[PDB]
Amino acid sequence: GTFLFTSESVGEGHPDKICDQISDAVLDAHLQQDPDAKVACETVAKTGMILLAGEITSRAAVDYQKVVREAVKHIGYDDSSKGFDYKTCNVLVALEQASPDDQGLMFGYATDETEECMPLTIVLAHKLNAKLAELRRNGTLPWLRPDSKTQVTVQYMQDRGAVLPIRVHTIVISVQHDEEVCLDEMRDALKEKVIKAVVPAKYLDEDTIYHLQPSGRFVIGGPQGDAGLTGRKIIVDTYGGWGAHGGGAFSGKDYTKVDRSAAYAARWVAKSLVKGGLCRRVLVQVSYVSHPLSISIFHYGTSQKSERELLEIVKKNFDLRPGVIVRDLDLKKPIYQRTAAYGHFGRDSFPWEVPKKLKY
Amino acid sequence: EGTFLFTSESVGEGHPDKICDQISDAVLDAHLQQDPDAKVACETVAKTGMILLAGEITSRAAVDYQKVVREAVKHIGYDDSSKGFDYKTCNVLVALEQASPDIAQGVHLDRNEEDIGAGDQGLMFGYATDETEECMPLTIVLAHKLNAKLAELRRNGTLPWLRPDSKTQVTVQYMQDRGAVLPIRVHTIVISVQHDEEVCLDEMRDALKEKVIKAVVPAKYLDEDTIYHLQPSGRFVIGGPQGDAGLTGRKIIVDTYGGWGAHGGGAFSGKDYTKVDRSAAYAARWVAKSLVKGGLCRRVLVQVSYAIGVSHPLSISIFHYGTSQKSERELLEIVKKNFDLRPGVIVRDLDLKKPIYQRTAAYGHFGRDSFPWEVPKKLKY
Numbered sequence: 001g002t003f004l005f006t007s008e009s010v011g012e013g014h015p016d017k018i019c020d021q022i023s024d025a026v027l028d029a030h031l032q033q034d035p036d037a038k039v040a041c042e043t044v045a046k047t048g049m050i051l052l053a054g055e056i057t058s059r060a061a062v063d064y065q066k067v068v069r070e071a072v073k074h075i076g077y078d079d080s081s082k083g084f085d086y087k088t089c090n091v092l093v094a095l096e097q098a099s100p101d102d103q104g105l106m107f108g109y110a111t112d113e114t115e116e117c118m119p120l121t122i123v124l125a126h127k128l129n130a131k132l133a134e135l136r137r138n139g140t141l142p143w144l145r146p147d148s149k150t151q152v153t154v155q156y157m158q159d160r161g162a163v164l165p166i167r168v169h170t171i172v173i174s175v176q177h178d179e180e181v182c183l184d185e186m187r188d189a190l191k192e193k194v195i196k197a198v199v200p201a202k203y204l205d206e207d208t209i210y211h212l213q214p215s216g217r218f219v220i221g222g223p224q225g226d227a228g229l230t231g232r233k234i235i236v237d238t239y240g241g242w243g244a245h246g247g248g249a250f251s252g253k254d255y256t257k258v259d260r261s262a263a264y265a266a267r268w269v270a271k272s273l274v275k276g277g278l279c280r281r282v283l284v285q286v287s288y289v290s291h292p293l294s295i296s297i298f299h300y301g302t303s304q305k306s307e308r309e310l311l312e313i314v315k316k317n318f319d320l321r322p323g324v325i326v327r328d329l330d331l332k333k334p335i336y337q338r339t340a341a342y343g344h345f346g347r348d349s350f351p352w353e354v355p356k357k358l359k360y
Numbered sequence: 361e362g363t364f365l366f367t368s369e370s371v372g373e374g375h376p377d378k379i380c381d382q383i384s385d386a387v388l389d390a391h392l393q394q395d396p397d398a399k400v401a402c403e404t405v406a407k408t409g410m411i412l413l414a415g416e417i418t419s420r421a422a423v424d425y426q427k428v429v430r431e432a433v434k435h436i437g438y439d440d441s442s443k444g445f446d447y448k449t450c451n452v453l454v455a456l457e458q459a460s461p462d463i464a465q466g467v468h469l470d471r472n473e474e475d476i477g478a479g480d481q482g483l484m485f486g487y488a489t490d491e492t493e494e495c496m497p498l499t500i501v502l503a504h505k506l507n508a509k510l511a512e513l514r515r516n517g518t519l520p521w522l523r524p525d526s527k528t529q530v531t532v533q534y535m536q537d538r539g540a541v542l543p544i545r546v547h548t549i550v551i552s553v554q555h556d557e558e559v560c561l562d563e564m565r566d567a568l569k570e571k572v573i574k575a576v577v578p579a580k581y582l583d584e585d586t587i588y589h590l591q592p593s594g595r596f597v598i599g600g601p602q603g604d605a606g607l608t609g610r611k612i613i614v615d616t617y618g619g620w621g622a623h624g625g626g627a628f629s630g631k632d633y634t635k636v637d638r639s640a641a642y643a644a645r646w647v648a649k650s651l652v653k654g655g656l657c658r659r660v661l662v663q664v665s666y667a668i669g670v671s672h673p674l675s676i677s678i679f680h681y682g683t684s685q686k687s688e689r690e691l692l693e694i695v696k697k698n699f700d701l702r703p704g705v706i707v708r709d710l711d712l713k714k715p716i717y718q719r720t721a722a723y724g725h726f727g728r729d730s731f732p733w734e735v736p737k738k739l740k741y
């Protein structure tokens with residue numbers, strides 16, 4: 001009675017994530033000037049090209065040059081030797097901006113297996129990419145480049161529906177590098193200076209499988225290696241394969257799109273229930289008229305209470321009308337670029353990650 | 361054990377996201393018809409008056425991209441500016457390069473058919489369920505089949521005022537049974553479809569209920585209380601790309617299990633078999649259907665995972681929702697004796713170098729009659 005489970009994550013310089021950041025950077029630029037701006041911005045990236053397409057209703061007037069190039073500068077693509085460069089890339093704008101003059105099924109999920117209230121597979125996957133970026137920027141590993149991917153397999157057991165992480169079974173890391181460092185040195189660095197500094201020692205053992213630079217070469221990367229598009233990392237963005245997904249992407253959409261804000265809300269509910277002591281693992285499902293059509297709470301058997309009883313607690317403590325959601329969570333503020341890498345869930349930076357006290 | 365509600369969505373060929381998925385695979389088919397070993401990774405972008413291709417291709421084939429793209433827009437049904445898009449007069453822009461030499465040395469160069477490494481890392485899921493002969497959730501089968509009937513009646517002349525863009529949503533009421541799910545009745549149906557200027561809504565809502573819903577949803581799930589939302593936002597004369605943006609790989613829940621099971625995040629369209637995103641998801645579906653159709657369980661989830669350059673899987677997991685005599689560990693062992701989930705062997709069993717892929721790009725990749733991953737394998741145990 002044990003099982004395995006896997007999740008991936010992706011660095012700031014991954015081509016799909018580059019577009020998620022540019023998309024949310026534009027949303028922030030518009031909101032900074034017009035709190036009621038309406039945005040649906042798609043980004044596309046390939047060798048030498050950043051392209052902006054979509055619709056916007058907004059009083060603002062945005063410098064898309066400074067917006068795109070500053071973000072590419074932050075990510076770290078600044079020379080042709082790296083495959084991309086913010087000073088010399090082509091910035092094409094096909095957006096349609098006007099002056100002012102949906103429904104769905106969304107999911108929330110939470111698990112008491114970590115402080116982040118998130119599956120250990122994805123938490124670890126995210127943190128490894130953050131560590132790569134941190135050692136690249138501070139000088140510790142100057143051969144590292146911005147494009148990276150990680151994935152983590154954990155061996156678990158059950159206990160009345162809750163999941164208990166036993167060991168890390170397999171870790172993958174592929175990362176774009178410069179032309180001077182050799183293969184042995186890279187695999188050594190990845191294990192000793194990145195993995196061992198990120199994964200708690202209790203999860204590591206002599207049996208753990210390492211696939212470090214498995215392709216054997218990764219000089220060509222970024223958009224030159226692989227075309228990038230907004231909203232192509234929706235599982236990296238959310239629960240790593242756990243829980244569920246209704247199917248909408250987050251980046252480049254404003255708060256009036258229920259796909260984003262109601263999804264955040266459902267995470268908020270799920271995290272509140274677990275941290276409130278009511279269950280150890282939970283799925284929240286909101287069906288969508290401003291009041292939601294239906295709500296069901298699946299606790300996997302980890303609550304003394306019944307599922308009817310939890311619904312009652314939820315209804316007595318929360319108002320999930322998109323209008324009210326937007327007020328309580330403060331979603332008109334320009335804080336969206338921060339969400340676009342390392343996951344929108346399980347970071348102690350955002351309003352929907354602060355649990356609510358439940359009076360019942 | 362107690363009833364609940366679930367909804368799935370589907371979209372028509374003329375929805376801007378699905379346009380991109382279809383073009384991507386039409387480009388893949390063009391290449392495979394000439395070179396079965398072509399490596400293709402084609403992304404499509406769609407917006408007011410433009411189709412753009414961006415991505416990577418290594419192929420011995422010669423392809424006329426303008427011809428391939430415009431033919432598919434015609435096939436979809438956009439031939440005039442009054443519909444919001446015209447294949448004769450749109451802008452087609454091409455940014456397609458060779459695949460990275462770094463990738464190729466790591467994956468395929470100097471290796472056997474069976475021993476080619478995975479094209480990328482990632483995770484993927486298979487799902488199946490005895491609630492239909494299709495072995496698919498009823499919510500998503502119905503939503504897809506509604507969009508199929510719409511395109512059928514539009515194309516053959518039965519309702520010639522219909523246009524290419526549409527969205528459907530189907531809500532079903534369910535009860536549990538020892539972990540399995542039992543579809544009882546349909547609670548809500550929602551349909552918007554693009555139409556010609558010259559038709560009235562009243563008449564249109566009537567054809568939708570009578571020629572479309574009634575001919576697709578078995579009568580047993582239809583009752584006095586079933587809520588119908590037909591053309592709920594009124595007239596819908598202009599559709600597709602016009603005033604809208606769309607991308608390849610943006611309808612990945614629609615493409616698969618309509619909210620049910622799980623997803624790993626890999627898009628299907630525009631990718632040849634060496635992308636495990638496609639090949640391994642197709643195989644996972646094959647496994648899951650075989651386990652259910654073999655009588656070994658009533659509902660099942662299957663996970664796999666890969667690392668770039670490595671042929672073998674990094675992990676395999678089976679979840680039966682409590683619907684089996686045998687344990688989950690017992691079911692894993694049966695899978696391991698019966699299947700070889702190396703991509704260089706999946707290609708052979710499912711025949712994945714054949715140019716069949718434009719068919720998969722609307723109305724779901726699963727629950728389809730003729731696709732190889734839907735013919736269940738007889739299992740030895």
Ligand SMILES: C[S@@+](CC[C@H](N)C(=O)[O-])C[C@H]1O[C@@H](n2cnc3c(N)ncnc32)[C@H](O)[C@@H]1O
Pocket residue numbers: 014015016147148149174175215216217218219220221222225226227400401416417459460462463466479480668
């Ligand atoms: C490997 S590619 C897959 C598809 C690719 N476009 C193709 O033409 O085959 C996707 C991701 O893998 C990572 N990657 C790119 N080149 C790589 C290499 N040589 N080795 C390992 N990973 C790589 C990048 O982060 C990239 O975003």
Ligand SMILES: [K+]
Pocket residue numbers: 226227228401403
């Ligand atoms: K890509």
Ligand SMILES: [Mg+2]
Pocket residue numbers: 016227228229232
């Ligand atoms: Mg991608």
Ligand SMILES: [Mg+2]
Pocket residue numbers: 481482625626
């Ligand atoms: Mg992926």
